Nucleic acid binder design. Structure first.
Lengths: 65, 63, 61, 64, 63, 63
RNA sequence: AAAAAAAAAAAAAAAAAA
């Protein structure tokens, strides 16, 4: 089955800073606030909506259980 | 399940937004409407933006 | 929706179709279906919608 | 109603030259020889297979 | 049914092939195998290429 | 399929792998795990690489 | 461009046979 939900849920739960590298190289830094089938909400100065199809990677700022 | 409430909030409040496309271009306007595949943005005219080409939607201020 | 928007075709407004690579294509929306839109300028060319980022009217429609 | 098969089949039937602009700007010129739901076959000396998902615009060298 | 006949023809005749990715990168090797979403190309090693990132599959010579 | 067993070869033999993204960036680490949409690449941290942004994945050595 | 471990982001190069 799926493993994307637990990976993002581990970061959202533990409040660990995360880097979302987009398909064009731009690195979004913030906190996973929520996510659904198609988007993730990244939080910093404001809460923005990132489309999953335009993400290449999601890197945790530190190892996560 | 949560994309609509996000965009919808931007429509209720009439808050300026900044849509970043997959190629880094930053479009700015007002979310007037949207459907499963596109978001209608406004400024001078009403332009139709395909969601498959949007990389990010940033509200100009917290809502 | 995208159909009532594209249906630009009626008012014969000139339109720009920005591609995902930044290229601007100016013509007129001649026709469309589920996947493509045909734009007219010198010939009727076929523009795939998956390569489209923005459809801007030259003026309020 | 499909607006795609007739457009390509007309370029095939009239053996009219074409230019396939890819999503990265590369312009491939050749002849539409065949196509299915996912690919077009462009022809010069060697027939190559082009994926539709990488195509941005298919344009005819002349009105068809 | 147009992809399968094409790739299999290069896989059967062992024809050197160029796989142009969507970002312009040109891979050169041989079509060892393929499935609905990937093509396994070969040279010093058998690398897996996703179809969604390929733009063209060109034979080194007519086939 | 042609990618479920392919990734598993790198997941079982612990061979360092290289993942090239659609934008040319080369990732490097070890296939920790994978599913229909993602691959976890390991090094300092275990990052989640989306398949749709993957063009190629080459084993660093013949497998 | 056999490939920039990655430009908090070019309101946008009618288009680099790559």
């Amino acid at each position: 089955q799926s493993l994307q939900d637990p990976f993002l849920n581990a970061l959202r739960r533990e409040r660990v800073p995360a880097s979302i590298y987009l398909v064009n190289g731009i690195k979004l830094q913030g906190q996973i606030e929520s996510f659904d089938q198609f988007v993730i909400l990244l939080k910093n100065t404001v809460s923005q909506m990132v489309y999953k199809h335009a993400i290449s990677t999601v890197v945790p700022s530190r190892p996560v259980s």
